[model samples]
Target chain A: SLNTEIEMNELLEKAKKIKCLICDVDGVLSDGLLHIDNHGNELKSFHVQDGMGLKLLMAAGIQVAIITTAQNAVVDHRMEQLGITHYYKGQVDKRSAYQHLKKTLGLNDDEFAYIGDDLPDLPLIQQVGLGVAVSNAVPQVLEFADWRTERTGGRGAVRELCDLILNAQNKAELAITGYLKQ
Target chain B: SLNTEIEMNELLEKAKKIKCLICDVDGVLSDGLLHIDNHGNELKSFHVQDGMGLKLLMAAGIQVAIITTAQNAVVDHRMEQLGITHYYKGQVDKRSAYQHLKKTLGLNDDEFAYIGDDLPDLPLIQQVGLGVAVSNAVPQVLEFADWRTERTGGRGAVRELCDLILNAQNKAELAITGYLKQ
Candidate 1:
């Protein structure tokens, strides 16, 4: 009924124009949660492989950032710990943040990768160089992503995407070193 | 989209009501990532399961907490290990912790259960009638659990929940379980 060949070719084309890869925090980086203590201490779950992927991107001189409409320090901590410097939190107008990101990084249209999971993120995903939809990503945004991930968010979807971008850029050494570096 | 009517009916019922259930981590617990020095501290890897399931109601019983200390990470480690994920941690306030949990998860005051993994855990096991000793739970806690599991935490405690909840409501699924590799 439908052809996968044309779609696969589109993915390849879209992938080539990317420079920075930006991701949403709640649904993309995490399962969208904040574990807190009685005193309000917080906990966030992140995939280690995703961290490794970002490290690979950074090592390769690619810029990465987090833009979200929610507030989360845990997100901040994880990104900072991973050496990601560009970030926007509690910004309702994510597009504004996206525009600011473009200006701050001096990026042109179609030169950025955006990873978002729900309804609010569709506009940006459709506009970016590459947009990714993690598993369980809502339908509206899923159709907008340049590609859909095999694994769900918080279930190694980021790792899968990282592997794709890294492999395309020929950087398998980063992930392969995981078992060895320890 | 298959015509899985009976299955959907059971899932809907399970969603409406849930009581207390015990929990333990380790094999059924940790994601299984660990950090170690050359001396071999035997690091831990936390599964994303605990963080996600515990955050959202994967099982019927919304009441949940960790029954591990040896297998537990300290606050900062916990924060990152799950890293800003769940609600509460730290071992100092067990009883009051359960009380606070009762109110937050919307459980009846006394309809909660305690989770314990070892001898130190007996104090908690002894208090709750809804004891569910993990498969690998220390023998001490097992003696009291109304349900002794074959699957240990970090391995199959969650599976046990799937079985018990489905079975109790008489919606047993033989396919997902049983030996597949045989």
Candidate 2:
């Protein structure tokens, strides 16, 4: 369930204009769980549908970027596998990287969307045209979010947002059809 | 959305009698994607909420078992982390494991539930009282399923089933509340 009709309509309008999507890593893509094996290596679980959603967005010519404060080899490998080139990791402050992306892509704030789950992601979320929070996010992030997903992070929440943006832009069916062909 | 009201009622009743849950791995828990690392290690993505759902089910005294034809160290490690004792991997035919589980737990056919996604799982799906399928399952599997999940595999589909069974047994809210307390 979302907001009232009027609010939802406004949100959809914002979603329709999105040209770029910026994402956070730990809580948004990995459920904020740090699984350590006997050798002290970290493990994270990602949603396969979320990966598919990213591919769908890319197929629709929508740019995707990943910005995270933590640096991990696993995250790097995953981003490489997804074919995402604009990846920024190990940033204590994310705004600089956001600014770099905005300058390099030449996209305005109103054309950008951000999805996050914690305080570190708050600034970009507030600045973007559409600000999304996962269901399991901290209370403060939820309070500031323009929209909250029904699914939690690392459990298809990102896919839900991708679907919404595509639907708003009237490109959902085409993107899905093209993906199915692959 | 599910079936009509009468059909849903019958499904609920069947779910209420489930004492043990049997699961298939590849397309049920791992989204059927085989990510091969540069080092030749196979990787699979699992939903975090699915893990939580399994924990909730175990907390409510419901037994959980894994029966998969694929044998991988990743699955073994995950099952161990979840504390699941009745795991049967690398079985081309799953019915023998199902029979062993039924005998060891002394549960009737009407008291067991199975969820799977492909051809190898068809026999067990038909044998269990509740036969569930993921949304992305093959056409033949979908035709024989008693219920189909809205969420795809490795994307919280198992969690959806866990919630359904917990709700049918009148233990959903309590299980979630206890989990939140932890």
Candidate 3:
């Protein structure tokens, strides 16, 4: 997840200006895989790094949210447990929701960062201050991305993004040291 | 840095294949500033991260070295404290030293990575598999750099490089965890 010198400097410069981070589900938050059983139950793999990253983001005074096309009880449960306040599920027109968030927070375009991996995410991705793409993202989405994660979706990609943001804000050590003791 | 996902993946792949990392002394290892006291003593600021990275690289079975144009006891004393094995001081033709290192180690160009900040570093930087530049490097040097560090000279840049190499080899956690408990 280490970035080149030029990229690191630029990311740090931009990250300090960010006030919120918005991410999609299926591919950006999860591994883009759904383990479905005959009973229609689903299981998803989540990384501890991603979980810790969000917590750290909140501690740094930045905001976090989820915007997804699909909805699931697991996703809802996880966000609830994490204390996330903003999320939109089963959303077909994400731009409207994004606009709603912007207006509600009174944030400009340059104040937000968006993480997306598919076609449906294009509209919002194009509008955010920082547009990030997961490694496994479709090529079209990559073209629009301002930054990309080293890891693929649902692995440690989200954590990488979180770390970059934290590093930029100069608060990464507080989060990273937590894992070192264990 | 904000490396593209593809470049990040490629960097990890190639970093894992690295056996040696060669760097300059004044700028790459220090803050590029030297203070001289009335007693004719020289002092330079060195980051702990860089020192720790070198030790971790050694533990991971990779070698480290220095090649510099200027001769200073301060540099020699620091390397001695770190137990580094290869160092060339006051060498005008860095290529000659580079060749000697290649011959002694019996490693190819692709197995080496070079970090430099000035014109003198170009020959080796061009020959090595990964050529890195510091953020504060000259424009000419930056143009030839394949990778750049987030920090300026002697400001944890080397540590960043060390972490990247460890991450590429999937050993960053082991290395980092050691520091977290403190």
Pick by DockQ: which candidate is best?
2
TM-score of model 3 vs. true structure: 0.49
How much lDDT does each candidate structure score? 0.59, 0.83, 0.78
Would you give me the overall lDDT of model 2? 0.83
Residue A9 CA error for candidate 2 (Å)? 0.2
> For candidate 3, what is the DockQ?
0.01
Candidate 1 per-residue lDDT, tens place, A1-182, comes to: 25688787677667666678888877777666555558755566665446655766666656788888866556555665677889988977688999999999999768788888988788888888888899779988887777888766764577667657766666555534442233
Residue B100 displacement in candidate 3 (angstroms): 0.4
Q: Give every collision pair in model 2.
A: none
Instruction: Name the 10 consecutive residues with the lowest summed lDDT in model 2 chain B.
Output: B32-41
Predictions' DockQ, in order: 0.03, 0.07, 0.01
CA shift of A96, model 1, Å = 0.9
Query: Model 1, B83-177: lDDT tens per residue?
Result: 23333443322455555656666665334444444433455556554455666554446787545556555554655554554455443433222
TM-score chain B for all models: 0.55, 0.94, 0.91
How many Å off is the CA of A158 in candidate 2?
A: 0.6
TM-score of chain B of 2: 0.94
- B94-177 in candidate 2: lDDT tens per residue? 778889888999999989889887656777889889999998765556889899999988899999999999999999887877
